[PDB]
Amino acid sequence: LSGKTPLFAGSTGGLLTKAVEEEKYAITWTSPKAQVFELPTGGAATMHEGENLLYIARKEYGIALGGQLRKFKITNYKIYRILPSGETTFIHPADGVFPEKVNAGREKVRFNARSIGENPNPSQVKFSGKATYD
Amino acid sequence: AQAVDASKNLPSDPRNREVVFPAGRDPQWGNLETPVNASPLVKWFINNLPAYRPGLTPFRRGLEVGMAHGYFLFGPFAKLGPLRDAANANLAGLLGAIGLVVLFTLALSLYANSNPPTALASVTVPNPPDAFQSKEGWNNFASAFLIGGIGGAVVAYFLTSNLALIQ
Amino acid sequence: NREVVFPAGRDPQWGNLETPVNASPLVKWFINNLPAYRPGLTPFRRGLEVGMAHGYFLFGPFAKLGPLRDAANANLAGLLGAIGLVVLFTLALSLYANSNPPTALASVTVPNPPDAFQSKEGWNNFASAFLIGGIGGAVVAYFLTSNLALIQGL
Amino acid sequence: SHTVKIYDTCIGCTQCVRACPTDVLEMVPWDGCKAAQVASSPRTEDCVGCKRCETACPTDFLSIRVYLGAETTRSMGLAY
Amino acid sequence: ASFLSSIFVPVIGWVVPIATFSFLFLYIEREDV
Ligand code: CLA
Numbered sequence: 425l426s427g428k429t430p431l432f433a434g435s436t437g438g439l440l441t442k443a444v445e446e447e448k449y450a451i452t453w454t455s456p457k458a459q460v461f462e463l464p465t466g467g468a469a470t471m472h473e474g475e476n477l478l479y480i481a482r483k484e485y486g487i488a489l490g491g492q493l494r495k496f497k498i499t500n501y502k503i504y505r506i507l508p509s510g511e512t513t514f515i516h517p518a519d520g521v522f523p524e525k526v527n528a529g530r531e532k533v534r535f536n537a538r539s540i541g542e543n544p545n546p547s548q549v550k551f552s553g554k555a556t557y558d
Numbered sequence: 559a560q561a562v563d564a565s566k567n568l569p570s571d572p573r574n575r576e577v578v579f580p581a582g583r584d585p586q587w588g589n590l591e592t593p594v595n596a597s598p599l600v601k602w603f604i605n606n607l608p609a610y611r612p613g614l615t616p617f618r619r620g621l622e623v624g625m626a627h628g629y630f631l632f633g634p635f636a637k638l639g640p641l642r643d644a645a646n647a648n649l650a651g652l653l654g655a656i657g658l659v660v661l662f663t664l665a666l667s668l669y670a671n672s673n674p675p676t677a678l679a680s681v682t683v684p685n686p687p688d689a690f691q692s693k694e695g696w697n698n699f700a701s702a703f704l705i706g707g708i709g710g711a712v713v714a715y716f717l718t719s720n721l722a723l724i725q
Numbered sequence: 726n727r728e729v730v731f732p733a734g735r736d737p738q739w740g741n742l743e744t745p746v747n748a749s750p751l752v753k754w755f756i757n758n759l760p761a762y763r764p765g766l767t768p769f770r771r772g773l774e775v776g777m778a779h780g781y782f783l784f785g786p787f788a789k790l791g792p793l794r795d796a797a798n799a800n801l802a803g804l805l806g807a808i809g810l811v812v813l814f815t816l817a818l819s820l821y822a823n824s825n826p827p828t829a830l831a832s833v834t835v836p837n838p839p840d841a842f843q844s845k846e847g848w849n850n851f852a853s854a855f856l857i858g859g860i861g862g863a864v865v866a867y868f869l870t871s872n873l874a875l876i877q878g879l
Numbered sequence: 880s881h882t883v884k885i886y887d888t889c890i891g892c893t894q895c896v897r898a899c900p901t902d903v904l905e906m907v908p909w910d911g912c913k914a915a916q917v918a919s920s921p922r923t924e925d926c927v928g929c930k931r932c933e934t935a936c937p938t939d940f941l942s943i944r945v946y947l948g949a950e951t952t953r954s955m956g957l958a959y
Numbered sequence: 960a961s962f963l964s965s966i967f968v969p970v971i972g973w974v975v976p977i978a979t980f981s982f983l984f985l986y987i988e989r990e991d992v
């Protein structure tokens with residue numbers, strides 16, 4: 425992970441003890457212009473001219489921030505998951521294409537070929553460990 | 559125009575000097591360095607308290623902690639408790655104060671046996687505090703709290719009861 | 726119904742036998758969680774809790790049955806007599822500690838190795854705590870019994 | 880943690896994947912020769928049960944469902 | 960016979976809660992049950 429931290433004085437809302445112990449997140453993006461943007465949790469900050477990086481508590485804050493970056497026309501937002509051992513994984517886009525646009529490499533999962541009304545009654549699957557939706 | 563209006567932008571102005579800073583150098587962190595949190599006076603006081611003092615054994619910490627609390631808890635039970643207007647008013651405070659120390663020591667050893675997660679680090683105390691990160695350290699702390707707490711309450715009882723003779 | 730008594734572990738070759746008194750759920754907890762076997766304590770804290778229990782125990786026989794029991798200084802004799810007995814108990818630990826004591830044994834009720842009593846340091850720290858807690862337990866029992874009339878008189 | 884089940888009545892609106900804050904959903908190609916696409920739920924551990932997708936799906940009854948289940952730190956949205 | 964109430968009331972209000980809550984707390988916080 426390489427990038428400049430946005431310039432902000434600091435805030436009570438932000439990283440907490442969970443970050444050291446459990447899966448802190450980090451978002452990365454490149455800017456064309458230095459602009460003022462609202463942080464995910466309180467306040468405002470100034471992004472640098474290129475290769476910004478911000479450490480984040482939850483994945484929801486990063487994607488919520490990405491929607492704000494799209495207002496500034498920045499679509500190269502990347503999110504990572506940082507475990508305490510330092511393992512960093514390219515978490516949000518697994519492949520370069522975004523989730524909205526289809527790609528051949530992906531595969532359907534948890535697809536129920538039946539209609540929703542065709543689900544079985546729960547009495548038929550009691551005392552079996554099965555669930556109706558499965 | 560007054561010069562105070564012109565100097566508002568300059569950094570030489572006493573206004574523009576900022577007292578508050580981000581926790582450490584990382585601004586992403588939760589805390590904020592403040593004169594209450596990160597002053598040299600407060601840092602010295604908190605870091606040198608028995609819970610944070612360097613080079614002390616866990617038993618010595620609880621004794622210093624217990625002797626304070628035992629000496630403190632005698633007051634409310636004596637003057638404001640029941641039987642406050644009676645010959646045995648001060649005696650009731652000694653028993654009630656020791657009662658909390660037993661209950662307090664129970665919670666300590668009880669919290670100890672349940673695996674305590676950690677002792678956290680903050681701006682006021684940057685290093686990890688002590689060996690309070692294990693059952694062995696917390697258990698010795700509990701036994702020390704009991705001894706000091708019983709002693710501190712007795713001291714407040716001796717001084718308070720025999721205050722007229724001291725005068 | 727079927728058998729209740731079993732051999733110690735899987736091996737019947739060994740001496741000990743698993744019995745209700747030896748290997749019940751209740752007895753295993755009490756013995757293993759007594760201070761002499763409780764996990765997560767240092768040698769000092771074990772001796773303190775043990776002595777505190779014994780000083781409180783040993784005060785009674787000297788006071789209510791020793792000489793001068795039917796006198797004004799009865800309860801005082803129990804405190805001094807108990808402390809003298811605790812000191813001898815403390816001295817015995819130092820000798821057993823300073824004589825290279827072999828080992829502590831592991832039985833069925835305490836299956837794991839019992840504690841770090843496998844050295845001179847563990848027993849010596851045990852002895853220092855016995856005197857501190859031992860004298861404390863007796864002093865506590867003295868003030869209660871001497872002032873029991875007041876505590877009830879409240 | 881949760882379980883997001885996607886049923887046969889999808890039509891490829893792509894509204895569910897957009898509304899998701901945690902990126903639990905994804906649009907994948909369907910083996911249907913004349914079916915353009917279909918949704919998916921590959922990373923279900925990050926579901927936060929906010930039911931925004933159920934509000935977005937325009938079928939008469941929802942092709943997508945979010946069944947609540949065993950909770951965790953991620954599902955409960957605990958930054959601490 | 961009235962002295963029984965002087966011994967049974969406090970243990971119900973103090974000893975039994977302390978024993979139950981102390982066991983239950985350590986039981987629920989146990990890692991393996
Ligand atoms: C149901 C059981 C129960 C019982 C038996 C008691 C009994 C008592 N409570 Mg109590 N209490 C209870 C539940 C109970 N409480 C609950 C649920 C609450 C929460 C609302 C309270 C809140 C409460 C308050 C807020 C106060 C009491 C006080 C008292 C005492 C007042 C007696 C008196 O008239 O003046 C006093 C008469 C005396 C003879 C002096 C009493 C001296 C104490 C009780 C000696 C205790 C020594 C103790 C056992 C040491 C413990 C260590 C040991 C565990 C090893 C009395 C002993 C009052 C008090 O101050 O007691 C000191 C008081 O202020 N209670």
Ligand code: CLA
Pocket residue numbers: 630632633634636637638714717718
């Ligand atoms: C409601 C709570 C309460 C009560 C009733 C008392 C009562 C008492 N405290 Mg006390 N104290 C308290 C809270 C309390 N304190 C707190 C919060 C602290 C820590 C900050 C202390 C620290 C403390 C010390 C260090 C000493 C006492 C002493 C005394 C006794 C004075 C002797 C006497 O009987 O004179 C008659 C008493 C009165 C007419 C009323 C109380 C007057 C005292 C002097 C008040 C002192 C506390 C202070 C004003 C609290 C504010 C602290 C805050 C700014 C942080 C008295 C029984 C002394 C003692 O042991 O006695 C020999 C002593 O050396 N206390």
Ligand code: CLA
Pocket residue numbers: 783786787790791792810
């Ligand atoms: C062996 C039998 C026996 C018994 C029962 C006693 C009993 C007594 N003797 Mg004595 N005596 C004996 C033999 C005995 N004597 C002999 C053989 C001699 C000749 C040397 C004497 C010479 C003698 C003298 C010269 C004096 C006494 C005195 C006393 C009294 C005080 C005891 C005391 O302070 O000890 C304190 C005892 C202890 C600190 C230890 C007590 C051990 C407890 C009871 C153990 C209990 C175990 C428990 C139940 C099990 C726990 C189970 C667990 C799982 C919970 C008491 C009545 C004194 C007195 O004046 O008499 C009135 C006195 O001055 N004795």
Ligand SMILES: CC1=C(/C=C/C(C)=C/C=C/C(C)=C/C=C/C=C(C)/C=C/C=C(C)/C=C/C2=C(C)CCCC2(C)C)C(C)(C)CCC1
Pocket residue numbers: 625626627629630705706708709710712713
């Ligand atoms: C100003 C100020 C302040 C205040 C302070 C205070 C008020 C204090 C406290 C006080 C206290 C709280 C004190 C106490 C003390 C106590 C003592 C003095 C104790 C004693 C003890 C003893 C001596 C004991 C002993 C013993 C033992 C241990 C055992 C055996 C027995 C005997 C008894 C021997 C503060 C910090 C807040 C803040 C800042 C400023």
Ligand SMILES: CC1=C(/C=C/C(C)=C/C=C/C(C)=C/C=C/C=C(C)/C=C/C=C(C)/C=C/C2=C(C)CCCC2(C)C)C(C)(C)CCC1
Pocket residue numbers: 704705708709777778779781782857858859860861862864865
């Ligand atoms: C039922 C039962 C039983 C019984 C039991 C018993 C009988 C008990 C014992 C008892 C005892 C045996 C008790 C004791 C206790 C003691 C105590 C209570 C102590 C105290 C202490 C203290 C408090 C101290 C403190 C101090 C110190 C340490 C130092 C300084 C000083 C002072 C004082 C502060 C048995 C188990 C057998 C079996 C089973 C069942």
Ligand SMILES: CC1=C(/C=C/C(C)=C\C=C\C(C)=C\C=C\C=C(C)\C=C\C=C(C)\C=C\C2=C(C)CCCC2(C)C)C(C)(C)CCC1
Pocket residue numbers: 806809810811813
């Ligand atoms: C529980 C238990 C057990 C059992 C036990 C029994 C059952 C019994 C014992 C017994 C014993 C072990 C006893 C002891 C006793 C002793 C005595 C009897 C002593 C006395 C002494 C005297 C009387 C002296 C006094 C004095 C002093 C100390 C000093 C100064 C001088 C005079 C002379 C004053 C066992 C071991 C198995 C294990 C653990 C637990």
Ligand code: SF4
Pocket residue numbers: 885888889890891892893894895896917918935936937938942943
């Ligand atoms: S029907 Fe629902 S799941 Fe299917 S594409 Fe439209 S919004 Fe997505």
Ligand code: SF4
Pocket residue numbers: 883898899900901902903904925926927928929930931932933945
């Ligand atoms: S509850 Fe709905 S919107 Fe929220 S993560 Fe799950 S599928 Fe997406």
